[PDB]
Amino acid sequence: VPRSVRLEIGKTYDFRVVLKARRPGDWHVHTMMNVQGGGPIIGPGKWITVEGSMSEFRNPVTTLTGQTVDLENYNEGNTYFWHAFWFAIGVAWIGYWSRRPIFIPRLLMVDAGRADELVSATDRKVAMGFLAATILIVVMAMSSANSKYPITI
Amino acid sequence: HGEKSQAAFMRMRTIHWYDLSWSKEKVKINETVEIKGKFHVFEGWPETVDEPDVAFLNVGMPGPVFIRKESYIGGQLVPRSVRLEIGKTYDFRVVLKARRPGDWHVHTMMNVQGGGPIIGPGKWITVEGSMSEFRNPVTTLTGQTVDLENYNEGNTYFWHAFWFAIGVAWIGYWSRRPIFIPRLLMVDAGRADELVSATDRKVAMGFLAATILIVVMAMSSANSKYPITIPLQAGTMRGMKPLELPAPTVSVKVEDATYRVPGRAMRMKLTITNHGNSPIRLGEFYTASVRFLDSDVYKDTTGYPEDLLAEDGLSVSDNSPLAPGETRTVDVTASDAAWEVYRLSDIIYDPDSRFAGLLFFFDATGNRQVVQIDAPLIPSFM
Amino acid sequence: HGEKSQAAFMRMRTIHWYDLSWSKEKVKINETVEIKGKFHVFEGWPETVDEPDVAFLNVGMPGPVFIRKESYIGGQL
Amino acid sequence: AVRSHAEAVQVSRTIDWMALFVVFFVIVGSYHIHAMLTMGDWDFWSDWKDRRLWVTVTPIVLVTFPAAVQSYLWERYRLPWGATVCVLGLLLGEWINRYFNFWGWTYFPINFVFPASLVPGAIILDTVLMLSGSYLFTAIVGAMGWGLIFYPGNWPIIAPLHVPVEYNGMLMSIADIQGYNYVRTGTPEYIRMVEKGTLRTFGKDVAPVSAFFSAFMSILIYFMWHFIGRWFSNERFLQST
Amino acid sequence: EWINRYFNFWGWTYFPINFVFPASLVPGAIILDTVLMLSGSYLFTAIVGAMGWGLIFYPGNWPIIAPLHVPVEYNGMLMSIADIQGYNYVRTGTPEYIRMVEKGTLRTFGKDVAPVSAFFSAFMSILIYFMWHFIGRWFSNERFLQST
Amino acid sequence: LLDKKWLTFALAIYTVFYLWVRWYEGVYGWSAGLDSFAPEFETYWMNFLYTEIVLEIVTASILWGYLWKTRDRNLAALTPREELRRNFTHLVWLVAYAWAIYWGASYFTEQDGTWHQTIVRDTDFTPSHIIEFYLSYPIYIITGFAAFIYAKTRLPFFAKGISLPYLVLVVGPFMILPNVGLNEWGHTFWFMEELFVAPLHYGFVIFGWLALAVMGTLTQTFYSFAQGGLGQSLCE
Amino acid sequence: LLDKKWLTFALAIYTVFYLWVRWYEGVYGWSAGLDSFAPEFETYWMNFLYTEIVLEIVTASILWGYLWKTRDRNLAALTPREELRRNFTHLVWLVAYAWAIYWGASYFTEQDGTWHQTIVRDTDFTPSHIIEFYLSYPIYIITGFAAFIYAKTRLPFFAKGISLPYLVLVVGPFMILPNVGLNEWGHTFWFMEELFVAPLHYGFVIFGWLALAVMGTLTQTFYSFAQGGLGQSLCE
Ligand SMILES: [Cu+2]
């Protein structure tokens, strides 16, 4: 039962959950039946002692594509790399528009008559470049994530 | 045509139509065609589709090419919505009268309150003749026989034309004079106080009084004539009679079911236990409007649609007779082009990869027992 | 008096009271009168009226001219 | 400048006709979108045309555009036919659709898919706006008339469809027989949002109570859409987009 | 989000980063900002840039979650790697049924859930951008109250 | 000559095109056009959709480009007679926009409406759709934007800035295009049936109200007309 | 000297205090800190809550009193250099307010968020709470009110009345304190589960928007800065 189930009021069920130790320490393992509109129903709990080191824990799972992966660190590299990439692009945009003075001179130029000078060539060229680069990078990233890993459900 | 597009697992696990039969294949105009069959309400009804607490038995056609003269669930007429019980099997019988000439795809759905249409299997029906010959005579409780093809059409058209004419007359009266620019200029340039005056106020009073008086006299006439009227009849009909099917003597447990991607076949392993007192053989596996039959066990005679019928599409690893009290595990392969034509292979795109169907076990005597299966469907690629 | 005005089919198809009995006809003040009977819950409960998932057994009177000292469904208060 | 008086009048006439075309057809399109996405389902089917929910809902959601179009046209041109033109455009769109798609493309009968009638309410609202030009007086009295004369005004069309019939052992109205016979695949019977009765409906009260509710909510909707139209009729120019 | 995830979800508790990673939004932000700057029309932004923000969300985030959508046969049930992660790493306060995700409908037609949802997001993003433009305009006022 | 017969052409081209489209969809609504995944449905509707999308994009681009390049730079030195002629041309294009609005918003919209209560939705590119939100919607969007550009580039009254009601009237009906896919999500997710009074089905109603700005458009066009050619005859 | 190293102190005190609090709650989140009614939970969290409440009330009182008593009466006779110094001090206190807003509204808020999807709520004074809505919320409320009082009492631009955006920015984040107990009723009554996109869970969102007045605050502070010290160099 990896998904939610439907229970009948007044019926008795027998359950069996399997746990693999992951962290060293004395832990209070309970057992609840969370309900759609009620919330958790905590059952009796028992102290369970785990000894060892977290670094030894493994969660190997084999996919239908014939690959064995460790869920402890699967996709962590790609996730971290892509978030760092996009954060770097954002920071580069901020830095490009923050090299020049930011707040008071720009506000004064805007208020004092027409500005028509704060944005000009080649800032428009840079904005076009980043817009095109973002679109193109997203499209190529989709293509790569579809060429690689061709089967997804 | 509505099918082939509904989610895969939800077409396969919502309702199950079997024992379907069509009274005739080609009918003349003003002729009667009858559809009979049964539909086991699936137990594993998905949460996203509301339970059949308020369901209506429609018939699938491209517009009123037939008229649903009668429709029954069990043995009771059901012109209104009904309440169906999950896990119960009902037998239905709808009566259609041909109305338009042409080849039409008559389906059969059970529309649901929160789910939408559930399209069942459909069969091509040929109608020959002319639409002008069609009649729909109905006799009211007031002792009058009327034809629903043209009843009240004259009154409706006349009254709509009358009121549209009154509106157009009002527009024309206020549009004989110049409309937009001179009036706007007179309004803006100081006080107008001249665009509306006698006898325009008299005309407005006349039309207001005429409208009120005409509506009142029309109500009086429509009450003096036709003195007996009843409201619209509505309300879900509860307490439908389910079928009292005997408890099956065959218990089937599904252990792993796989389908090739891409492919046209479905592979599945069953552990069959045969109770009762007769050797049984698996003959048919109905998954969703598609009948996978074993030609060496059972053959279809009810004229099921060819595109939905697989005469030899159900291959069993060991289809030898199963003696009572004996349990065997066999491999069941369900391969047919229909499994791809009707898009049962897109369940890989579909968030809930679980299936269900009907297994038809036939003995030497001939009588069958219907047992249900429900198990996860695991795609395979290599 | 509240009746006679409720829809017809819905008065006729909601609940069914039978085996009704009244302990006494005329009582003094501070005296006890008991009402007994049974009510078959109709199967064809209309959709427009919610199912009796949350129902309460009242007694019909023009204001607290009697006090509902006790009320039982089955044998339970 | 214009050469003389005569061709000035001719140009004014041409502008009147051409702008009338423009406003009428834009109103047709937009008001038909509004009606067909707020009251369409009841308006499609005679069996859907009941006496509780049809009467309740149709004036409330359908008096919107007449309010705005009056609040502009009357106030600015002294043209007392905003509601009348809105209703005539809506009916023209409905009838073209019904005759060329419902009956022409498909084959639903006209007596089954006829639209509602609204000209009485439109005429009352427009004449109440013109006579005693107070917009508040309109929003009270004319809105009540619009909400109240809907069902009695439409009664002569649907009364012949309410004759009781014993259809295969079940009491059935002729509108119900039409809905049962002429199969609408996309519109099943349970979707029909019509009267099904309540414990607290008292005989002959569904038709008048629903009419009065429609009149009241029509007062409210007219009051808000008067200012909606007033805002839409502004002539402001934005210096920047 | 990343400070919270790394120092509380993974530091304080021990949910894995590949399980509790946040979404990616920089592509949509860049599109919206550059569309605002070039052709500075706010209405043009609220149409085109808002559509870009609503539409490039899922494809922009796809390279991160695509490796988590590989199908797995997990104890006889078809399971995605994201589902396996959610099933394994127990979140006591967030049970499985609360998960408000796609469960299918009678009227979803194959490969339409991803694009139709994206277009709905783009449209409602147009509306939300249009209203929040004036919300921000009001918030940016410089009015002084003479009394509190 | 003042108003010339471009109004006749504007009415006739739309009438002929839409009558031809109506005949085409009446013939091919069934019989290669009922099934979403039929191979004949592909070659009869998907290629039509792609062709109409490409043609409408090209037409919008060329119209906008030509009409914005042919803008009158010296608006101040404009004779009143030619100003009136341009006002008449702008009103003719408003007629075209109104006719396109009607066809896109009532006939084919209600059309889909019936096309729905006759079968069961099977895709987000059903044929009635290809004809309405995939053809008539771009048609009236293009016509409205063309009218806006013509007013801006030819009429001094609509110069010196952007008219708010006119912009609303041009955008809201266009804004029905980004919602063409609004309800469709409140569908494969929300409304799992066929209706019209549906809530999710209101992103076309709230924005069906935006066409009410046509009356502000007409009052501004009337003020533009009554600049030098008010009379003499009017106001007396 | 103009801006002096009070900004370094303002950053450092908050950083050290919040890092110490984070270490404390990481150590004591479990193990005397999981059970609501444990006697060790009492002496480890309830006394902490009471002490932090008393200390924050005392700090707010003394800050408000000192800063309102030390108001500059003769605001007109103020040298531009010292006016700029006061503007810098006000901006430093705005930095402190922004840092406190961040810590109160993201780190510890999300913190409770995770603290919730790891166990099951057991009281309205859970430890993560004591740290967030019972400590960081008073911290940034006090800092915002201190910045408001300093601006009012030292800056002639923020004199002559009360700035509406600035008051909103000071109150809305404070207004998150009377809603700290809003959702909790839409809980023991409404939402009976754990979520974030919950409706009742919006009295912090509608009022999370009130912090958007910071941009009006910054534009007013910039106008205050550009009174006598605009240039010369700027505007040329
Ligand atoms: Cu079909």
Ligand SMILES: [Cu+2]
């Ligand atoms: Cu009584």
Ligand SMILES: [Cu+2]
């Ligand atoms: Cu829809």
Ligand SMILES: [Cu+2]
């Ligand atoms: Cu909460």
